[PDB]
Write a protein that binds this ligand. Structure first.
Ligand SMILES: CCCCC/C=C/C/C=C/C/C=C\C/C=C\CCCC(=O)O[C@H](COC(=O)CCCCCCCCCCCCCCCCC)COP(=O)(O)O[C@@H]1[C@H](O)[C@H](O)[C@@H](OP(=O)(O)O)[C@H](OP(=O)(O)O)[C@H]1O
Ligand SMILES: CC(C)CCC[C@@H](C)[C@H]1CC[C@H]2[C@@H]3CC=C4C[C@@H](OC(=O)CCC(=O)O)CC[C@]4(C)[C@H]3CC[C@]12C
Ligand SMILES: CCCCCCCCCCCCCCCC
Ligand SMILES: CCCCCCCCCCCCCCCC
Ligand SMILES: CCCCCCCCCCCCCCCC
Ligand SMILES: CCCCCCCCCCCCCCCC
Ligand SMILES: CCCCCCCCCCCCCCCC
Ligand SMILES: CCCCCCCCCCCCCCCC
Ligand SMILES: CCCCCCCCCCCCCCCC
Ligand SMILES: CCCCCCCCCCCCCCCC
Ligand SMILES: CCCCCCCCCCCCCCCC
Ligand SMILES: CCCCCCCCCCCCCCCC
Ligand SMILES: [Ca+2]
Lengths: 163, 97, 49, 162, 76, 188, 286
């Protein structure tokens, strides 16, 4: 409740953050270590990489729980789901949890969101966040150029249909 | 004026070597290709075309400091590449040999 | 035609020998550094100047 | 006196190796550039409080020969410290306009005076609030040669004047 | 419908790349230009003041750069 | 493009077309228009090195041309210098266009410009109060007054004197009194 | 896949022509299906309007945004702080030269009247005055230039007399540059030797060259090509030219914002990694 909401704000002591960083790089290396074979074949080491997933999903869920109990959820106008980067972490962890539902259509499209886990490096290093904002600030004026390019492509595509 | 003179001289020497003998075709063809500087004459005549040419030359002289650095860096990369792949780009039409 | 040159560069065994696919595969870092420097950095340096 | 004697002051406290060495380099240039035209002497008695009076007459009889006289004082760290005495040398100001280069220089100049940095910077600043007209010549140059030629040119002007 | 991967990767990778590297080049080259300009202006300013004080005792621009000055004034 | 097309025609014009090479029925030097299309292809970077390698020395020469050996090792210089020069000249065109517009590209919404003038033209259709709410001797004096209120050059008499100085500096081409007549309307 | 059989196919092939990739093959296909007289009017305007004009607009908009952002309050503050640092360092260098001349004249005076201390210190001062003299600059540039000539002429199937000549010349040049570093470091003092970043470059390059020599002694086959980077010391010829300030301040700006550059080449790496893992998910093994 509220007696414990006071304590896990202290839990964000910097070694905890660097341990979350460490598990993020560990997950990135595990993802980069995979190899794909055509027709349902799989390598002898891909099984081990597939068994190492529950530790990662558990650590991410534990981190989300700490951030959800120490902070709010949506209510206090400052909380987990009211931060842009914390929403991406929530999507990643929630979808990883949902991928352990034992159905058919999940695996092909619910395993793909797992590639957004390297972006938790940006989500965990505020300097990278400000650098990313600097990058993306100069590409809002390019929206009109995007509309113009799409209009030119439409006109020339219509002409190509005609001829 | 040097360009005008070389154009005219090339034309005249090309006319002079017209012996219809076939002794040298590479030289006469080169003197023919030298005619292509002929439209380059109208840039000294038109003042605005000359102004555009001067602006281009000014930009080239503005980037001349970094062009030297660029060719030095690419020389270094070329020498590294020669140390790496010198003699190794040989092959057969038969992949097995 | 840079991917063809990259393929020849990686698939290069030794001096006066024919290729071998996938050999010397770590020689892509010569072509990743080169694009970082000349096509990406220096081109934009001239464009800015 | 017949001539106004040369006095160096302005970087920081005399007796400390920073000011001592800067003034000594300028002094050595002034010496061996004007060979046969300037007199060299070292002064250790406090003129600002005027044994004390035993040397002022010595200054006159060097200054009485229509020749430049160099005063290697060891206690002057202020132009107004001498303003009450009638000796009246030229107050040459070896000025450095930014205290940060002074502090980094004190760091650069060995290890001993690193602990003497604070008081020396404080007194340098104290001299810095002094008004420029109290001084005779300003040495704002950072290069040795530029400051040297500036002081030498003003010395040539004084030489031609008298 | 698997060509959206390549369309997105060639749109958001040929203009984000350009944005990043052109930002680097423009920022650093403009800093260099302003540094050389300012050090030269200070050099003649100091030289003129030094000549004035020493004699007293003994007795265009590019469009980018003009627009930069205008932006400086406006933001000031 | 003209110079390089003519050099290509007169040097690499009689290479025998071969659909297995880069001098084809599509990409030859045999006419001014085909050569110019080839140079436009090379400008956009479409396997221009392949064209160079198919334009080198010792190539099969066209049957109806008299020469037996056609193509030349001038292709290295030709193609490399074309890429360099075309890229440089098009960069200069790009930069000239950019700097011809640099006050628009660096525009601020708070600071005025031609947009305010066009919108005031729209105001033609009292409404001046509404536009003052909406902002960032009939339609010229008002324009001068609004420009004065936006950018600043008794202080009112000083502004009038500055307006007179500017009008004298920029007196129009063969006008009797165009800006001068505006000055009586621009004074207050 | 590249046809105009539909609005979506037409959009895809037009977009592919916009990127100037395979836009001629699509043109050369309409030159076979129909005549070749009128097809260029569809593609040359398309290329001009989509690839040249749009690149022009992107460059213009980006440069305008850069100009607007550069002259803000915090960016201007950072630039003025950098300028202040440069001015302070320049003045401090001048005053340090002042004090060094003072040291020299003093030490000469005490020697005009522990003995090995004085000997070694005057030797140090003589070296430090030598390594800054203009003739040392020119002799070092001559050695560097004669080094690049020995590496620019390595070619395939070179004569065996040349291979041994350059093999021994590499050792000679490594010895000469190690001697130059030793003299320079002893004269200026290690704390001051690394005050100039270009000396850090030279030290790192000669260390890498020694590492390459050792590694080639162990395994003759490989060659890291680090001994060539000594050609970058030819770049000092700009010192005696009126263009030292521009290039030096460019390098100063780069090294100052070398943290905002590494954290830009990293976000690019993160996005390339994300797209690599996405491509492995979608097309992996197929
Ligand atoms: C960065 C974007 C993405 C990556 C693409 C990379 C693309 C690379 C392109 C970036 C820059 C290339 C264009 C700049 C051209 C260089 C300008 C001219 C040279 C130059 O300015 O010098 C260096 C360059 O340092 C380098 O790193 C030497 C140059 C090597 C640069 C490459 C290093 C590797 C880069 C990564 C580390 C920096 O200038 P400096 O300050 O060190 O110069 C000192 C300084 O002036 C001292 O005052 C001077 O002493 P005094 O003359 O006695 O007062 C020193 O003289 P001495 O040593 O003889 O005593 C000089 O050596
Ligand atoms: C001197 C510093 C400023 C760098 C300047 C580099 C170039 C101006 C010079 C340096 C030595 C020259 C090279 C020395 C010898 C070679 C090998 C030579 O190959 C052959 O002799 C034919 C090959 C064979 O038949 O085996 C071709 C020219 C080349 C690259 C020369 C090209 C021009 C080079 C590179
Ligand atoms: C405030 C910042 C919100 C950033 C949103 C994350 C975007 C990540 C890219 C998804 C692909
Ligand atoms: C001088 C500028 C124009 C040069 C024209 C090309 C030179 C002559 C053709 C190359 C040689 C043909 C075999
Ligand atoms: C078996 C190991 C081979 C190593 C292959 C490395 C390939 C590198 C590709 C590009 C990665 C860095 C790009 C970042 C540029 C901003
Ligand atoms: C595994 C041995 C060879 C490694 C492949 C790359 C070697 C060269 C790396 C980059 C060297 C040039 C750096 C840029 C400075 C001009
Ligand atoms: C056997 C499967 C047949 C259908 C496959 C269609 C392609 C799958 C969707 C790919 C969409 C890529 C999205 C990338 C967004 C950045
Ligand atoms: C039939 C030609 C065989 C090779 C002869 C030409 C060799 C290369 C010539 C390059 C000329 C370039 C400079 C001329 C324009 C500045
Ligand atoms: C393969 C036999 C050798 C052929 C050499 C012919 C001369 C090559 C001309 C190169 C001209 C230099 C191009 C530089 C462009 C700026
Ligand atoms: C290989 C073809 C060469 C084509 C030459 C185009 C450019 C030539 C230089 C421009 C003319 C310069 C003359 C001097 C003007 C100051
Ligand atoms: C500046 C760009 C010029 C490009 C013009 C190329 C036109 C080529 C058309 C070739 C097809 C034959 C023309 C029939 C009429
Ligand atoms: C009989 C006609 C065969 C195909 C001709 C294609 C010509 C395409 C029409 C011209 C397209 C102009 C683009 C609009 C902007 C300049
Ligand atoms: Ca291509």
């Amino acid at each position: 409740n509220v007696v414990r909401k006071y304590a896990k704000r202290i839990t964000e002591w910097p070694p905890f953050e660097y341990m979350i960083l460490a598990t993020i790089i560990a997950n990135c290396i595990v993802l980069a270590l995979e190899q794909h074979l055509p027709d349902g074949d799989k390598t002898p080491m891909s099984e081990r990489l597939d068994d190492t997933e529950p530790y990662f999903i558990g650590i991410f869920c534990f981190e989300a729980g700490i951030k959800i109990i120490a902070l709010g959820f949506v209510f206090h106008k400052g909380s987990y789901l009211r931060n842009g980067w914390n929403v991406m972490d929530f999507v990643v962890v929630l979808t990883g949890i949902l991928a352990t539902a034992g159905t058919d259509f999940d695996l092909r499209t619910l395993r793909a969101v797992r590639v957004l886990r390297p972006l938790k490096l940006v989500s965990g290093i505020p300097s990278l966040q400000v650098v990313l904002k600097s990058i993306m600030k100069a590409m809002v004026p390019l929206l009109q150029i995007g509309l113009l390019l799409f209009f030119a492509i439409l006109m020339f595509a219509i002409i190509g249909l005609e001829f | 004026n040097i360009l005008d003179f070389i154009v005219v001289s090339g034309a005249l020497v090309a006319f002079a070597f017209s012996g219809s003998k076939g002794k040298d075709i590479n030289t006469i063809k080169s003197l023919r290709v030298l005619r292509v500087l002929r439209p380059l004459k109208t840039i000294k005549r038109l003042p605005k075309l000359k102004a555009v040419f001067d602006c281009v030359v000014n930009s080239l002289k503005n980037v001349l400091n970094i062009l030297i650095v660029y060719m030095l860096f690419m020389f270094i990369f070329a020498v590294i590449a020669v140390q790496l792949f010198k003699g190794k780009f040989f092959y057969c039409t038969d992949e097995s040999k | 035609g840079w991917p063809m040159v990259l393929k020849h560069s990686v698939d290069a065994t030794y001096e006066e020998q024919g290729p071998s696919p996938g050999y010397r595969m770590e020689l892509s870092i010569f072509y990743v550094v080169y694009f970082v420097v000349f096509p990406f950095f220096f081109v934009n340096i001239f464009v800015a100047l | 006196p017949s001539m106004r004697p040369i006095i160096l002051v302005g970087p920081s406290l005399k007796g400390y190796e920073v000011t001592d060495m800067m003034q000594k380099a300028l002094f050595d240039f002034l010496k061996h550039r004007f060979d046969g035209r300037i007199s060299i002497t070292r002064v250790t008695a406090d003129i600002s409080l005027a044994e004390v009076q035993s040397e002022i007459e010595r200054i006159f009889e060097l200054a009485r020969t229509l020749q430049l006289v160099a005063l290697d004082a060891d206690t002057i760290n202020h132009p107004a410290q001498l303003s009450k005495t009638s000796l009246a040398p030229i107050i040459v100001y070896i000025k450095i306009t930014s205290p940060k280069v002074l502090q980094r220089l004190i760091k650069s100049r060995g290890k001993s005076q690193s602990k003497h940095l604070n008081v020396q910077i404080a007194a340098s600043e104290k001299l810095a609030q002094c008004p420029p007209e109290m001084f005779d010549i300003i040495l704002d140059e950072n290069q040795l040669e530029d400051a040297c030629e500036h002081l030498a040119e003003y010395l040539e002007a004084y030489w031609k004047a008298t | 419908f698997s060509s959206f991967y390549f369309i997105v990767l060639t749109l958001f990778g040929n203009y984000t790349l350009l944005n990043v590297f052109l930002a680097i080049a423009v920022d650093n080259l403009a800093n260099a230009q302003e540094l050389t300009k300012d050090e030269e202006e200070m050099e003649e300013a100091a030289n003129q003041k030094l000549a004035l004080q020493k004699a007293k005792e003994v007795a265009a621009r590019s469009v980018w750069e003009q627009r930069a000055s205008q932006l400086r004034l406006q933001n000031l | 493009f003209f110079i390089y097309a003519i050099i290509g025609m007169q040097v690499f014009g009689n290479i025998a077309l071969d659909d297995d090479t880069s001098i084809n029925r599509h990409n030859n030097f045999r006419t001014f228009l085909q050569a110019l299309m080839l140079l436009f292809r090379s400008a956009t970077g479409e396997a221009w090195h392949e064209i160079m390698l198919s334009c080198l020395s010792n190539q099969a020469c066209d049957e109806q041309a008299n020469a037996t050996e056609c193509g030349s090792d001038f292709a290295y210089f030709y193609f490399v210098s074309f890429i360099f020069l075309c890229s440089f000249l098009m960069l200069n065109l790009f930069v000239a266009v950019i700097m011809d517009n640099f006050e628009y590209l660096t525009r601020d919404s708070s600071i005025l410009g031609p947009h305010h003038l066009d919108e005031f033209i729209r105001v033609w259709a009292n409404d001046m109060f509404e536009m003052l709410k909406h902002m960032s001797v009939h339609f010229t004096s008002t324009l001068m007054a609004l420009i004065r209120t936006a950018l600043e050059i008794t202080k009112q008499h000083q502004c009038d004197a500055e307006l007179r100085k500017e009008i004298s500096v920029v007196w129009a081409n063969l006008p009797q009194k165009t800006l001068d007549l505006l000055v009586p309307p621009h004074k207050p | 896949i590249t046809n105009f059989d539909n609005i979506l196919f037409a959009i895809l092939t037009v977009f592919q022509c916009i990127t100037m990739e395979g836009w001629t093959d699509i043109l050369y296909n309409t030159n076979d299906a129909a005549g070749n007289t009128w097809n260029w009017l569809y593609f040359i305007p398309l290329i001009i309007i989509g690839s040249f004009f749009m690149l022009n607009l992107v460059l213009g908009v980006l440069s305008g945004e850069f100009a607007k952002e550069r002259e803000r309050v915090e960016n201007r503050r950072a630039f003025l702080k950098l300028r202040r640092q440069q001015q302070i360092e320049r003045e401090l260098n001048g005053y340090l030269e002042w004090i060094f001349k003072a040291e020299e004249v003093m030490l000469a005076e005490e020697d005009r009247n522990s003995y090995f201390r004085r000997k070694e210190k005057m030797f140090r001062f003589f070296i430090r005055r030598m390594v800054k003299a203009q003739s040392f600059y020119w002799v070092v540039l001559c050695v560097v230039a004669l080094n690049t000539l020995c590496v620019a002429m390595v070619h395939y199937n070179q004569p065996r007399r040349l291979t041994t000549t350059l093999y021994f010349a590499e050792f000679v040049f490594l010895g000469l540059f190690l001697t130059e570093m030793s003299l320079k470091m002893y004269g200026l003092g290690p704390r001051s030797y690394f005050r100039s970043s270009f000396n850090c470059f030279d030290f790192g390059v000669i260390v890498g060259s020694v590492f390459e020599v050792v590694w080639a002694a162990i395994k003759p086959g490989s060659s890291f090509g680090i001994s060539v980077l000594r050609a970058l010391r030819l770049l000092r010829i700009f010192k005696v030219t009126k263009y030292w300030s521009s290039l030096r301040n460019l390098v100063v700006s780069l090294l100052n914002s070398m943290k905002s550059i590494i954290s830009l080449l990293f976000l690019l790496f993160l996005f390339i990694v994300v797209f690599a893992l996405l491509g492995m998910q979608l097309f992996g093994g197929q």
